[PDB]
Design an enzyme around this catalytic site. Structure first.
Site, mmCIF file in Angstrom:
data_model
loop_
_atom_site.group_PDB
_atom_site.id
_atom_site.type_symbol
_atom_site.label_atom_id
_atom_site.label_comp_id
_atom_site.label_asym_id
_atom_site.label_seq_id
_atom_site.Cartn_x
_atom_site.Cartn_y
_atom_site.Cartn_z
ATOM 1 N N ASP B 7 7.509 12.494 -45.875
ATOM 2 C CA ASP B 7 7.443 12.708 -44.435
ATOM 3 C C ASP B 7 6.040 12.458 -43.909
ATOM 4 O O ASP B 7 5.321 11.612 -44.472
ATOM 5 C CB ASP B 7 7.969 14.146 -44.150
ATOM 6 C CG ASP B 7 8.591 14.257 -42.770
ATOM 7 O OD1 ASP B 7 7.853 14.483 -41.814
ATOM 8 O OD2 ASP B 7 9.830 14.046 -42.639
ATOM 9 N N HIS B 45 5.687 17.260 -37.824
ATOM 10 C CA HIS B 45 7.051 17.129 -38.336
ATOM 11 C C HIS B 45 7.189 17.674 -39.752
ATOM 12 O O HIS B 45 8.038 18.525 -40.017
ATOM 13 C CB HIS B 45 7.486 15.672 -38.221
ATOM 14 C CG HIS B 45 8.913 15.396 -38.546
ATOM 15 N ND1 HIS B 45 9.273 14.851 -39.770
ATOM 16 C CD2 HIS B 45 10.015 15.483 -37.761
ATOM 17 C CE1 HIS B 45 10.585 14.643 -39.704
ATOM 18 N NE2 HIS B 45 11.082 15.025 -38.520
ATOM 19 N N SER B 197 16.713 16.096 -39.198
ATOM 20 C CA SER B 197 15.689 16.391 -40.227
ATOM 21 C C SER B 197 15.722 17.874 -40.568
ATOM 22 O O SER B 197 15.702 18.241 -41.742
ATOM 23 C CB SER B 197 14.285 16.055 -39.741
ATOM 24 O OG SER B 197 14.021 14.663 -39.621
#
Lengths: 92, 230
Positions: B7, B45, B197
């Protein structure tokens, strides 16, 4: 027999960089020889190429920065299974 | 059991996940305003997802051991080639307990990304990915379309689709609306985020716990148990 693959979502395509995937069980020494043949054939035709990465351990092959004009030539290399144009991925 | 996360960069010392994530050497991202390139934004994120998996207060598998690979830039963008090289890095680390690989990203259907995921699954790796947030058929995206990867769609508390991708390539749906988790805005900050996600990270946490309790649990058994408990 090798095929070309590219992202169906046109805005996510990244032409000019390709993953050249070789047939299963292709040895690292053969991946290096195939990349060398591509660079030599592209140079004979007046094109610059750069091998960015050589894959071994998971899948055999290599990552190459080159003009898409060279795809027909690269697809004829005997150990090639398929060639894929790079494309973008995004956080979900 | 370890959960590998491919990620963005992570704020590894955020209090919610401090000690959980071993940041690996791996980084392969495409080129990167100044505000959007600050660490607190670059890390957003991945830090939230590492919290969903392992966080002390809000983790699904509280205390889980994780390893992070950076394949997404500060704007959350990566390449299929960088992701492939990251998957090869994991395979090389495995050749030198059970492994869960979390891929909270999507691009268009990619033959090579699906093939790389398939090779890891054939070696016994449990891969979990986001179905995608395009209100479309997940079979059109990768790694979502790989049958060997557990593809996770997002639902809310009332089991309604959050929008989330759907269809024959989605193995299960998991919580993905307003998920509270670590925010990289500050070392103790939290934020709610929605998406496939977050749903995939929830399933990775469930899988890690199942594999810790039963190390001989195969992917085929595990997959059906995860699909049932959704």
């Amino acid at each position: 027999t090798a095929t070309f693959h590219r992202c169906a979502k046109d805005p996510w395509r990244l032409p000019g960089t390709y993953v050249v995937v070789l047939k299963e069980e292709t040895h690292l020494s053969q991946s290096e020889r195939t990349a060398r043949r591509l660079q030599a054939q592209a140079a004979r035709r007046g094109y610059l190429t750069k091998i960015l990465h050589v894959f071994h351990g998971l899948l055999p092959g290599f990552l190459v920065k080159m003009s898409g004009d060279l795809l027909e030539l690269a697809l004829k290399l005997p150990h090639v299974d398929y060639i894929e144009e790079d494309s973008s991925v995004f956080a979900q | 059991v370890e959960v590998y996360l491919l990620d963005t960069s992570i704020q590894s010392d955020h209090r919610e996940i401090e000690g959980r994530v071993m940041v690996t050497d791996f980084e392969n991202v495409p080129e990167e305003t100044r505000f959007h390139r600050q660490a607190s934004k670059c890390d957003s994120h991945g830090t939230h997802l590492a919290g969903v998996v392992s966080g002390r207060d809000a983790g699904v598998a509280k205390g889980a051991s994780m390893r992070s690979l950076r394949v997404l830039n500060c704007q959350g963008k990566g390449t299929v080639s960088g992701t492939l090289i990251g998957l090869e890095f994991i395979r090389k680390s495995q050749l030198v307990g059970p492994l869960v690989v979390l891929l909270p990203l999507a691009g268009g259907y990619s033959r090579v990304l699906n093939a790389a995921c398939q090779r890891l699954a054939r070696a016994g790796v449990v891969l979990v990915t986001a179905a995608g947030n395009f209100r479309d058929d997940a079979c059109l995206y990768s790694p979502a379309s790989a049958p060997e990867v557990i593809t996770v769609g997002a639902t809310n508390a009332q089991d309604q689709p959050v929008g989330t991708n759907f269809g024959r390539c989605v193995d299960l749906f998991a919580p993905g609306e307003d998920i509270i988790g670590a925010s990289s805005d500050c070392s103790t900050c939290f934020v709610s985020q929605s998406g496939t996600s977050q749903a995939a990270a929830h399933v990775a946490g469930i899988a890690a716990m199942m594999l810790s309790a039963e190390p001989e649990l195969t992917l085929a058994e595990l997959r059906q148990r995860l699909i049932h408990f959704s």
